[PDB]
Amino acid sequence: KNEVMSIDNMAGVFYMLAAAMALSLITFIWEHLF
Amino acid sequence: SVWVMMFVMLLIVSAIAVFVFEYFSPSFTIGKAIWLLWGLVFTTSKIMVSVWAFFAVIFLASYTANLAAFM
Amino acid sequence: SVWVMMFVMLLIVSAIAVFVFEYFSPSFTIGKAIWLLWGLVFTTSKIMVSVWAFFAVIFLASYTANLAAFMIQDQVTGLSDKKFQRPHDYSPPFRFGTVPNGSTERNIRNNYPYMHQYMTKFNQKGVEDALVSLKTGKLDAFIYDAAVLNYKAGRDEGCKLVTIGSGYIFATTIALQKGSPWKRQIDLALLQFVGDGEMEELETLWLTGICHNE
Amino acid sequence: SFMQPFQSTLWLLVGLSVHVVAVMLYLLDRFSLTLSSAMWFSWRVLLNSGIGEGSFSARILGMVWAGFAMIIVASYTANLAAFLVLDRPEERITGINDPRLRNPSDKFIYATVKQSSVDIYFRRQVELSTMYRHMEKHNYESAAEAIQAVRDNKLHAFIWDSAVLEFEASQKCDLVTTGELFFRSGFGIGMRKDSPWKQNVSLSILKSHENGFMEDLDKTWVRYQECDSRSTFENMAGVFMLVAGGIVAGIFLIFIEIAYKRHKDAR
Amino acid sequence: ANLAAFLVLDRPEERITGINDPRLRNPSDKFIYATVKQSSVDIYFRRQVE
Numbered sequence: 001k002n003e004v005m006s007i008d009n010m011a012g013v014f015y016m017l018a019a020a021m022a023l024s025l026i027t028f029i030w031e032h033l034f
Numbered sequence: 035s036v037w038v039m040m041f042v043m044l045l046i047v048s049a050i051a052v053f054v055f056e057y058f059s060p061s062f063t064i065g066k067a068i069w070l071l072w073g074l075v076f077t078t079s080k081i082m083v084s085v086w087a088f089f090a091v092i093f094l095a096s097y098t099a100n101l102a103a104f105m
Numbered sequence: 106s107v108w109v110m111m112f113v114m115l116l117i118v119s120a121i122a123v124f125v126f127e128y129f130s131p132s133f134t135i136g137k138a139i140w141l142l143w144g145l146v147f148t149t150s151k152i153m154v155s156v157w158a159f160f161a162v163i164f165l166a167s168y169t170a171n172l173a174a175f176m177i178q179d180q181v182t183g184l185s186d187k188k189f190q191r192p193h194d195y196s197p198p199f200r201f202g203t204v205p206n207g208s209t210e211r212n213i214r215n216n217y218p219y220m221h222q223y224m225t226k227f228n229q230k231g232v233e234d235a236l237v238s239l240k241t242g243k244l245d246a247f248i249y250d251a252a253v254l255n256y257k258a259g260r261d262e263g264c265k266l267v268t269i270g271s272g273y274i275f276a277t278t279i280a281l282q283k284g285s286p287w288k289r290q291i292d293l294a295l296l297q298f299v300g301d302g303e304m305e306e307l308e309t310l311w312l313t314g315i316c317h318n319e
Numbered sequence: 320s321f322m323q324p325f326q327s328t329l330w331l332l333v334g335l336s337v338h339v340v341a342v343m344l345y346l347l348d349r350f351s352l353t354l355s356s357a358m359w360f361s362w363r364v365l366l367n368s369g370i371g372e373g374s375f376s377a378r379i380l381g382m383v384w385a386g387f388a389m390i391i392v393a394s395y396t397a398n399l400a401a402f403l404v405l406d407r408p409e410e411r412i413t414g415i416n417d418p419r420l421r422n423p424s425d426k427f428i429y430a431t432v433k434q435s436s437v438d439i440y441f442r443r444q445v446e447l448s449t450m451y452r453h454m455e456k457h458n459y460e461s462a463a464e465a466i467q468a469v470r471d472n473k474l475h476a477f478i479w480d481s482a483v484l485e486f487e488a489s490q491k492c493d494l495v496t497t498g499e500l501f502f503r504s505g506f507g508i509g510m511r512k513d514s515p516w517k518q519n520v521s522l523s524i525l526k527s528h529e530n531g532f533m534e535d536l537d538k539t540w541v542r543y544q545e546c547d548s549r550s551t552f553e554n555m556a557g558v559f560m561l562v563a564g565g566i567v568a569g570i571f572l573i574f575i576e577i578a579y580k581r582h583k584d585a586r
Numbered sequence: 587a588n589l590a591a592f593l594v595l596d597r598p599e600e601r602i603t604g605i606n607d608p609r610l611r612n613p614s615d616k617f618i619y620a621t622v623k624q625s626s627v628d629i630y631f632r633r634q635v636e
Contacts, residue, residue: 006407007325007398008105013387017336020383024343027376028350069378073370076385092589094393099590101397107551114559121570128574145368149577152362153569159366160562166396167554172587173400177595212529260612278528299504300443310636315608400590 044071047083054079115142118154125150179267181246184275192223200244202227202235209249212276232257239266248275259314267316320554322561324402325395333391337365340384347377364388412476414498415447423453427475430457432465437478440502469493482541489544 048071052063058079070080074087122138141151145158181188192199203210205228214221227244229235236257238244246269247254254268269275279295281287298304323330344357351374363369364381365388412419419427431437431454441447441454457474459465466487468474477484481500488494508524510516527533602609609617621627 002406004406006402007329008394009326009329012390013332013336016383016387016390017339020380020387023383024347024376024380027379028347031350065375066372069372069382072382072385073372076370076382076389094389095589098393098396099593101393102400102590103593105397105401107555110551110555110559114563117563118566121566124570125573150573152359152368153566153573155366155368156566156569157562158368160558162367162392163395163399163554163558166399167552169396169587170400170403173590174403176587176591177404215529216531259608275534276529277533300440300502302444302502304503314612318608 047071047086051079051083114157115139118142118157122150122154125153179270182270183273184248189220190217198223200227201246201248202229202244203247203249204229207249209276255316256312256314259312259316259318261315264315320403320552322557325398336387337361340365343380344377347380367392412497415478415501420447420450423449428457428473429454429476429478430459430465430468430474431477431479432460432462433458486541486544489546492546 048063048067052067055061071083074084075090075093119134119138119142123134126134142154145155146161146164188195188199189201201224203224210221213224229238235244235247239246240262248269251268251274255272258264258266258268279291281291340361341358344361345353348357360373360381361384363371364385367388370385415421420429441450459468462480462483465474465477465479469477470493478501481496484494484496488496508520510520605611610619
């Protein structure tokens with residue numbers, strides 16, 4: 001009977017939140033000391 | 035390489051419209067140009083980029099239907 | 106009543122915005138408030154109404170899904186149509202034919218003689234006459250031995266020729282010489298064979314083509 | 320149909336991510352407006368009122384939040400199409416070939432009327448032997464008994480008289496004929512063997528078959544009656560409940576909270 | 587709606603499921619099937635009937 005389930009719990013956002021925090025780190029380090 | 039297509043074509047058309055308004059100069063490039071790109075991903079030649087915005091709805095609808103494919 | 110629900114709730118929210126204006130008063134309600142309502146159908150309380158805007162996305166998605174409900178999931182009805190019964194009251198006049206001196210011809214001579222005076226311009230000779238004349242559009246459709254037409258239904262190239270309706274049967278319903286001693290035995294036999302399901306084995310052998318696997 | 324079916328677990332994850340939005344945007348300020356500005360930029364984009372404009376990097380991350388929001392809304396519209404079209408819709412008995420008759424159960428009870436013709440067509444055939452020790456122990460005595468047993472939600476299904484069932488499906492909205500026919504026979508007249516009334520009666524019968532009197536009774540007693548076929552929802556009703564309650568509850572917070580801010584302005 | 591529809595729904599394909607298909611049962615000239623002569627498939631066919 002098409003063995004799927006009857007919501008969704010992919011990882012997804014977790015990788016996307018980690019990418020967003022990574023971008024925050026990649027940006028806010030570059031302070032203009034020169 | 036869908037994301038590659040997105041970054042490449044947005045870089046191209048963005049640089050286009052920037053130098054378009056630099057010929058208009060008789061608003062910011064790396065400022066407002068990128069934000070108004072991505073804003074309708076989600077003063078007459080501005081319209082010409084928002085043509086993509088209507089296709090962006092299709093680029094919405096495709097990733098509706100594609101996810102409607104996989105879900 | 107769905108559109109009624111829309112109008113009623115927007116009247117309520119408009120009244121709410123009017124409250125919020127008249128207690129801002131120590132920018133048009135009647136103007137701009139309705140326009141900004143409908144605008145996100147498709148400065149604090151502006152927010153409280155735009156809460157609906159997020160549900161309006163749901164009121165988007167519902168009428169996506171509802172139409173995703175309805176966009177995922179004949180002509181002649183029978184002998185009682187005066188398409189047959191009045192052919193020259195409709196232009197062009199119709200084209201229907203039968204196999205000459207068949208039983209149905211006798212039954213419609215008992216039914217409609219003037220119709221026979223039309224139908225005699227439409228005789229055929231064989232089966233592929235009917236088949237090609239429908240596949241080339243030389244006649245409109247047919248009325249015959251209908252189970253035979255159900256056989257030839259499931260056999261078509263792409264199955265685009267379907268008989269009358271969904272199996273609605275009109276002019277409905279083994280030969281022995283009279284006085285033979287053979288009635289009772291053969292009847293008992295055949296009612297056993299009907300009774301014990303081997304008729305359905307015959308059905309699986311010879312009846313179906315594509316159409317019952319619709 | 321429902322409420323929000325989308326995992327109150329995940330709804331708490333979404334709300335705490337809204338807190339992630341707010342906390343991050345107000346922490347990324349002083350790197351170079353500090354109370355509720357970026358709050359309403361955030362709730363403007365994520366809810367979907369404006370996408371509009373309003374150093375580089377916090378605006379970058381806000382566009383990342385727009386990407387989040389569009390992914391999340393796409394996921395919602397995906398599942399809202401999905402569980403209104405797809406699986407777990409129903410479970411419908413298709414015929415004798417189903418295992419619900421073939422492998423019988425106690426939560427599926429089937430019955431007929433004793434001393435009937437269905438008793439005959441069963442007790443003649445073979446491979447439904449396992450049927451009888453169900454099918455003989457729960458029977459009835461008349462048709463209306465079976466009808467009300469469907470009405471009283473006592474019995475699930477019936478194998479019975481096809482014309483009568485097509486009527487009471489077309490009469491009342493409770494009934495559906497499912498599957499093909501079984502034991503295909505005819506309804507006719509009963510006469511004794513020495514009764515001489517065979518032949519002329521049969522003549523009249525074929526006259527009735529050919530002269531449309533069969534169709535006459537099919538019109539005058541058989542073909543009149545139809546019910547609807549599903550052509551203001553519980554989702555709609557639940558949304559008006561939630562949104563009406565929440566916004567009237569918001570109304571009766573606006574006065575007190577802003578009036579205390581009017582006291583702050585009086586300070 | 588239609589972009590979801592004609593990426594999910596009907597007219598996707600037509601795939602032969604087995605001997606029970608009419609494409610073997612009612613044979614055609616645009617469907618041609620074959621084997622190797624003097625093989626065991628020749629045997630299991632020429633023994634059975636229908």
